[PDB]
Amino acid sequence: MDMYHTKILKAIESEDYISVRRRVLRQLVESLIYEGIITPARIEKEEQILFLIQGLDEDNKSVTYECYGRERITFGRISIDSLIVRVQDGKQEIQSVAQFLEEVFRVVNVEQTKLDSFIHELEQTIFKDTIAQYERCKSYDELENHLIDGHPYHPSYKARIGFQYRDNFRYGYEFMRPIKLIWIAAHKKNATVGYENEVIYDKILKSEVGERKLEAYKERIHSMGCDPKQYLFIPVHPWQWENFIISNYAEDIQDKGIIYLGESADDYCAQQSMRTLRNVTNPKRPYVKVSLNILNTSTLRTLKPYSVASAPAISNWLSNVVSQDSYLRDESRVILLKEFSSVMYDTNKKATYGSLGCIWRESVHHYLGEQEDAVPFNGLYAKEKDGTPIIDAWLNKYGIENWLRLLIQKAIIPVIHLVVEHGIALESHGQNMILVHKEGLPVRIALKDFHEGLEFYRPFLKEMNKCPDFTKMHKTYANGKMNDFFEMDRIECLQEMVLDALFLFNVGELAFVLADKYEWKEESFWMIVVEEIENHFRKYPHLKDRFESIQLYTPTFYAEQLTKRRLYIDVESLVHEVPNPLYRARQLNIQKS
Amino acid sequence: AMDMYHTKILKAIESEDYISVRRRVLRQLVESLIYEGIITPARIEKEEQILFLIQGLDEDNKSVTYECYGRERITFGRISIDSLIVRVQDGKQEIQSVAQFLEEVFRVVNVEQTKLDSFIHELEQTIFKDTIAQYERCNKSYDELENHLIDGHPYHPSYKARIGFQYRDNFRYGYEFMRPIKLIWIAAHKKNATVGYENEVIYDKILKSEVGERKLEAYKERIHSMGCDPKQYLFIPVHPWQWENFIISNYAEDIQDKGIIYLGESADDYCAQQSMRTLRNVTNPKRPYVKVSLNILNTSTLRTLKPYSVASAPAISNWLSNVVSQDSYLRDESRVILLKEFSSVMYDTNKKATYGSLGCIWRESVHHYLGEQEDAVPFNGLYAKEKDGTPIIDAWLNKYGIENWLRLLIQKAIIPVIHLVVEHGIALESHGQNMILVHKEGLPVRIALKDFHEGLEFYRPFLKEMNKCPDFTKMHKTYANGKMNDFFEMDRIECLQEMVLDALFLFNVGELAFVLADKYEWKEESFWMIVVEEIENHFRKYPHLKDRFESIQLYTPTFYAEQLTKRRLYIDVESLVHEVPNPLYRARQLNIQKS
Numbered sequence A: 001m002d003m004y005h006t007k008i009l010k011a012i013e014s015e016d017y018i019s020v021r022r023r024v025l026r027q028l029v030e031s032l033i034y035e036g037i038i039t040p041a042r043i044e045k046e047e048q049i050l051f052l053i054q055g056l057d058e059d060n061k062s063v064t065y066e067c068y069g070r071e072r073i074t075f076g077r078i079s080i081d082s083l084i085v086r087v088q089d090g091k092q093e094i095q096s097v098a099q100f101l102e103e104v105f106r107v108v109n110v111e112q113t114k115l116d117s118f119i120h121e122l123e124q125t126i127f128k129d130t131i132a133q134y135e136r137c138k139s140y141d142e143l144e145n146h147l148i149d150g151h152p153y154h155p156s157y158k159a160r161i162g163f164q165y166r167d168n169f170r171y172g173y174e175f176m177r178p179i180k181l182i183w184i185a186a187h188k189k190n191a192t193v194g195y196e197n198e199v200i201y202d203k204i205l206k207s208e209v210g211e212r213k214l215e216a217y218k219e220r221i222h223s224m225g226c227d228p229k230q231y232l233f234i235p236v237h238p239w240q241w242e243n244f245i246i247s248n249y250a251e252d253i254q255d256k257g258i259i260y261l262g263e264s265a266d267d268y269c270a271q272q273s274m275r276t277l278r279n280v281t282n283p284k285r286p287y288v289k290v291s292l293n294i295l296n297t298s299t300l301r302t303l304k305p306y307s308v309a310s311a312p313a314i315s316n317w318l319s320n321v322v323s324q325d326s327y328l329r330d331e332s333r334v335i336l337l338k339e340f341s342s343v344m345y346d347t348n349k350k351a352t353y354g355s356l357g358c359i360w361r362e363s364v365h366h367y368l369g370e371q372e373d374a375v376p377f378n379g380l381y382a383k384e385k386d387g388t389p390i391i392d393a394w395l396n397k398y399g400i401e402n403w404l405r406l407l408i409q410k411a412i413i414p415v416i417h418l419v420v421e422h423g424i425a426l427e428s429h430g431q432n433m434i435l436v437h438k439e440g441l442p443v444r445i446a447l448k449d450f451h452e453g454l455e456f457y458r459p460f461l462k463e464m465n466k467c468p469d470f471t472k473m474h475k476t477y478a479n480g481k482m483n484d485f486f487e488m489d490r491i492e493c494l495q496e497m498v499l500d501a502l503f504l505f506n507v508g509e510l511a512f513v514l515a516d517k518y519e520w521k522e523e524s525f526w527m528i529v530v531e532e533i534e535n536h537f538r539k540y541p542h543l544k545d546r547f548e549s550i551q552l553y554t555p556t557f558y559a560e561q562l563t564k565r566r567l568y569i570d571v572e573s574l575v576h577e578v579p580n581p582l583y584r585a586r587q588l589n590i591q592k593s
Numbered sequence B: 001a002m003d004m005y006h007t008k009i010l011k012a013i014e015s016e017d018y019i020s021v022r023r024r025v026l027r028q029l030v031e032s033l034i035y036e037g038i039i040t041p042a043r044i045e046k047e048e049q050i051l052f053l054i055q056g057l058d059e060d061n062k063s064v065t066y067e068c069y070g071r072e073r074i075t076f077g078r079i080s081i082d083s084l085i086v087r088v089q090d091g092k093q094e095i096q097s098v099a100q101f102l103e104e105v106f107r108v109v110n111v112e113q114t115k116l117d118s119f120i121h122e123l124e125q126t127i128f129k130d131t132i133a134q135y136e137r138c139n140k141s142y143d144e145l146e147n148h149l150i151d152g153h154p155y156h157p158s159y160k161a162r163i164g165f166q167y168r169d170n171f172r173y174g175y176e177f178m179r180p181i182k183l184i185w186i187a188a189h190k191k192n193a194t195v196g197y198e199n200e201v202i203y204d205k206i207l208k209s210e211v212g213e214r215k216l217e218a219y220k221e222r223i224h225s226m227g228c229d230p231k232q233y234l235f236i237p238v239h240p241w242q243w244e245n246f247i248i249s250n251y252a253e254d255i256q257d258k259g260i261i262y263l264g265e266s267a268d269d270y271c272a273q274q275s276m277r278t279l280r281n282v283t284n285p286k287r288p289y290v291k292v293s294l295n296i297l298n299t300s301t302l303r304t305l306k307p308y309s310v311a312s313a314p315a316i317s318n319w320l321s322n323v324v325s326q327d328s329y330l331r332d333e334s335r336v337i338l339l340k341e342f343s344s345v346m347y348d349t350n351k352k353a354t355y356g357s358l359g360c361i362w363r364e365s366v367h368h369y370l371g372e373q374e375d376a377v378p379f380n381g382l383y384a385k386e387k388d389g390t391p392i393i394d395a396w397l398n399k400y401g402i403e404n405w406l407r408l409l410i411q412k413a414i415i416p417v418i419h420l421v422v423e424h425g426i427a428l429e430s431h432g433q434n435m436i437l438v439h440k441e442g443l444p445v446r447i448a449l450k451d452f453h454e455g456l457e458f459y460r461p462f463l464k465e466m467n468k469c470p471d472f473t474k475m476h477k478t479y480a481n482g483k484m485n486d487f488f489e490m491d492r493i494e495c496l497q498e499m500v501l502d503a504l505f506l507f508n509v510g511e512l513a514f515v516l517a518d519k520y521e522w523k524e525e526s527f528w529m530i531v532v533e534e535i536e537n538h539f540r541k542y543p544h545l546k547d548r549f550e551s552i553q554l555y556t557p558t559f560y561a562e563q564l565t566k567r568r569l570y571i572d573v574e575s576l577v578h579e580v581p582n583p584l585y586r587a588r589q590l591n592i593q594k595s
């Protein structure tokens, strides 16, 4: 029982445990109410709404949870502004997420086994975020790690299922511990580089492994009676290696389908993603994104085999699109961090699916000019331990309206441009975006993580015949159907990625911060947004009909219910209708002319 | 950097011990799938041998066949598979993938996919954990044998799963590695913590010894300086894996509110037994064992302690102790030892997820009982073998002779268990790990029994005193809301016959008959004819037991044995039981032919 043991106990006994508990509860309740999963009584007061949530205790008798909140013009999102108080005889602030959920779900029905996992994820989030917060007291690399807060919406934004406290201290991105990758050799019976990636992959091994070290690895392979020409080389997260590959691949290790080689020469360090590591020794070198079998936000951190296969072809396709577009290339100067090489070992087995794979991505340091710095886009709405907006200084310096205008211009507009001019919808969540700035002045946007979340509407492409052919890349694409991967047959996929991903779940978080902290009204926020959208597309008259057909000004739209998906089995279409703030903003924008 | 433990794991996986373990795990798997009728291969009979042809389908839905040779044995019709398991499609190849074997076989035969995946995972983890153990083993007192029999269960195809241990934890806590460990002491608030039923006085006394007055005093002073009242807490020892990987992360809210308070480490070192949640005191061998909660899955079940069973443990042991001390045969002739679970404590809340997760039962050290020339061996040790295949009882058999040794064994070991059933209506769970042979240089002396709290069944009409039967309904709220057959008490007399045939014989004593036949050419028929003679010899001394003995029907031709593997492949099923022949039946027929 060492110092890390002591740390963990102190973290829990501290005020940071209370604070983290209150936050998970807050976020949980906002989400249940917003999505209409529960339906409290609502008593209106001047600004606030008092919600009364019904439940039943273990004894099948009545209980109320009280809290005060707001229903916001920004997509009708709910903010809970107070403690969540359990009323039976006497009032007390809720101590147990588990108790809260089960009392509340005796009244409203859910699938029990889903409830159980969800409760476990919320508890683990509290646990893991408690010690992150207890452990905290810039520039891009530091900021990635030091914004430890994680997701503003998802009740369990920290679960890390499969990490107990020591692994968490070792691997959690908040702690910034250097680590080494494990190099293995993987037999070509089951291993493949990314589609049409062979030349690039062979070149990247030269710089990544090192030339001499690679020769020495091949000699060792020969010294076992194996033929190095029959193998590819894959880096593996050391946690993944020790806790997953060794036990689940034993059969491949015994027959030399997999050969342990050794440790990377360079040290690496986790990013917000944690399956994504930067080279600490040489920061110009590519990041590596590797398989991790760990459950964070209800999904395993595995890399899908079809997705790994296609990552390089996708980055090459996108890079061409952007390079032939004068606005994106010359004016907004958008940055795409290319996932330019990939490799994987994929056997039939269901249990190991997506468990060993790697994608290399360009460092954002390749792109940063001198004088330029970068911040993760979800950092723009982040706060200091004492609750001060991390962008406070900048806003004081540049003014709120001017800073926000520039932000919309350098960051939001290019994303929407891509949707309307190209029918290409990049996953627009804050975690995919990085703002490049100069002393806090917004300059250009960088985008990443294409291989997982990209969507597109084929008829809008400039060249349909240049659209990468997915069916030739993987048997899974080949046997798949329309809408399963990347391609939508519905034009509404475009409207939805913009309203839902870009605005409701990401940029909208900024509007909350500016309203509550600087008294900059949400109506004025969406005003600026409409104005900049309009200033852009007025320069592109041929886009007029198409802009309209996308309907960004629709008075309401159907938004994903992300939390409901966690409580229910069928989950076919879980959407709820919400108001669209752009609608009213545009009506006022029109009157104002 | 990757260390020497990493290097070991890799060498073990890359070695020949991996091939043997894989082969063994496949063998036990196929044996039980055929035995329980989960699959029904074609059977082609040679003189003795059977060729088994098992159907499957590959992923392209093309037929495949698995082939092996084996036997159906007179001992309960158990299946022995004597040859490698070969996959036949185009060519023939020994099967390398337990997952593939199971996937192909279950494309033909329907199971629950979900259960199939877990089972495959457990089989792979078994292979993985046992490979490291077989690889580390080299080429003996009681304590030394507990940790040196590394083979685990001869029936269950995954006998090593240990779901929740990766290789490093396995090295630390796996009983094969005999690593000394410290218990973690916690204080638990009496709002949720209780001593076992009517155990308060014995518990207070046992904390004196186990913690020490000095430490306990210092423990109380620590709680007091946190502004908590030392009189509101009990004290529970926790496995250090359980504390760090389970309690700390799942009890955070109890730690926050001082429902649970960390005190420190035990003074003494402990070492795991075959059970791994049961720890012996290494520093002071006469001190009691600790059986503690562990949330890991071995053989498909969580290693938690059921709260109701922790609560009734001290009372069950007092009850059994009294039954023995008033019976001349058991007390005087047999001299049976019952290692008493004499104290227990737990912290138990509502939460479903932590159910059974923090609990402790203390048990008497077998060293309390051993005479000056006596030693002890775990009962499943009797059928264990050395890495090279020599039965570990080999020297003893050479010294006393086989028939003489087997008769003494039956007379001192098997008879008193059966006596308990017939005279007392009490069936202790009689499997191999519940029994300890006490011997003098390999001469069988007497039997010691353990693990009462979970396993025991009884038939109320058979009790010598039905009113001395402990009233469980008063001990825990789960017993009081429970129904007949739920815990400990069976309404059917067949409960008793099944505990003898199925637990004592089929899954335990029968394994010895296999070893004697295959190693020494001692025929299974002779083995069972000795068992019958000895049972008869005993009961001819107790005429008052005749009609009771008859009604139990140990000589019935066929009976219903548990299907243990089937249970791992289905959520719900109609039976769980299958009919097997009883070797005591024919043996008795023949024993009768003497007169």
Ligand SMILES: [Cl-]
Binding pocket: A141, A142, A144, A145, A269, A270, A271, A272, A278
């Ligand atoms: Cl980083």
Ligand SMILES: [Cl-]
Binding pocket: B397, B398, B520
């Ligand atoms: Cl012999």
Ligand SMILES: [Mg+2]
Binding pocket: B275, B433, B434, B451
């Ligand atoms: Mg046992």
